[PDB]
Design a protein around this ligand. Structure first.
Ligand SMILES: COc1ccc([C@H]2CC(C(=O)O)=NC(=O)N2)cc1
Ligand code: NI
Length: 341
């Protein structure tokens, strides 16, 4: 049964609701972005209209083999009509093709669904500033004051300087970056740029990157794991045993691994700065866990909501326990009292 926080009242619309079969009354299925728990259930035998960004559309067509007749790509920052309802897609600052959706209901109410997002002040200068929002469906992944992490730009700076230093000292060192399906591409593309290298990867990952509208992408990537000093592996394999095994396959081209595991958050952030981050090392392999988040920090989330001043907030993450629900409700109340709305 599709839960209430994936349903848009006064429409036939759902959001990221593809693992429930045919939802009763749903005339259009919106997909905010191509991450697994959000698209889980889509396949080549889906027969209902999907509305999404152009990049998400490319991925549905090529990775999942969804028939072209069911993919409805919409441009960003543009007033569109879907089944008689005005909608706008906004960049979510999450992963390639990820959007937030504004719905303008027939009764005059306006709803913003954030999808997954990392809130930023630049969002204040989009079509969002043009009207009042009555309901907000909010990505509450890190809705607690202990979640601090640096900006993405500080984290990339750290990664670039670390990698450049290691390969300048040892020209036979290899850099490895852990990955999921999409998101955090800037980590490996920025490192490879400073090293003057292409990025080595699996055929399936190569195919994914071809779907993302990155300029000159086919010059930056390869499946040749011997003519590349930056390689991608599944996040699962970023550990001493997986990396030892990987070094064996490269055929005496490399004698050292520097690896990055670009997670969301690690509690070590609490009492330690980005300059202070130290690797785990065993012999010729070092592993850095870096807090490259594609979700809002507590403070980013707070500032966004206090600017928007919604009448009602519906959380879409951490909704499964009484404690979690209660804790989020308390923060929303503090935010409202502080700002005076
Ligand atoms: C139930 O009421 C509260 C819940 C959380 C806090 C946090 C949050 C905060 C902030 O958001 O600036 N400032 C704090 O010092 N503590 C304060 C009151
Ligand atoms: Ni996501």
């Amino acid at each position: 049964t599709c839960p209430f926080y994936k349903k848009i009242p006064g429409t036939g619309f759902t959001v990221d609701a593809f693992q429930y079969g045919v939802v009763e009354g749903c005339t259009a299925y919106f997909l905010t972005h191509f991450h697994s728990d959000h698209y889980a259930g889509l396949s080549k035998h889906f027969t209902f209209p999907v509305y999404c960004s152009e990049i998400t559309g490319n991925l549905l067509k090529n990775k999942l083999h969804v028939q072209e007749q069911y993919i409805h790509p919409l441009p960003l920052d543009t007033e569109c009509i879907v089944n008689g309802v005005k909608v706008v897609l906004l960049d979510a600052n999450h992963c390639p093709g990820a959007v937030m959706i504004l719905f303008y209901l027939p009764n005059g109410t306006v709803i913003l669904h954030t999808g997954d997002f990392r809130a930023d002040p630049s969002m204040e200068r989009s079509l969002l500033a043009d009207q009042k929002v009555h309901m907000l469906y909010l990505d509450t992944t890190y809705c607690s004051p202990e979640y601090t992490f640096p900006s993405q730009q500080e984290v990339i700076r750290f990664a670039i300087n670390t990698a450049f230093e290691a390969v300048t000292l040892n020209p036979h060192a290899l850099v490895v970056c852990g990955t999921y399906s999409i998101g955090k591409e800037k980590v490996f593309l920025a490192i490879a740029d400073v090293l003057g290298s292409k990025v080595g990867m699996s055929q399936e990952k190569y195919k994914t990157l071809q779907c993302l509208n990155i300029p000159e992408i086919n010059s930056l990537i390869t499946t040749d794991m011997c003519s590349s000093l930056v390689h991608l592996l599944p996040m699962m394999q970023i550990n001493f045993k997986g990396l030892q095994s990987h070094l064996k396959k490269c055929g005496g081209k490399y004698n050292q691994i520097l690896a990055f595991r670009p997670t969301g958050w690690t509690h070590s952030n609490k009492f330690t700065r980005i300059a202070d981050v130290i690797p785990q090392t065993k012999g010729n392999i070092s592993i850095y866990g870096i807090p490259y988040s594609e979700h809002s920090s507590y403070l980013e989330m707070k500032r966004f909501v206090q600017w928007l001043k919604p009448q009602k907030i519906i959380p879409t993450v951490n909704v499964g326990t009484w404690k979690s629900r209660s804790t989020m409700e308390k923060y929303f109340r503090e935010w409202k009292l502080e700002a005076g709305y």
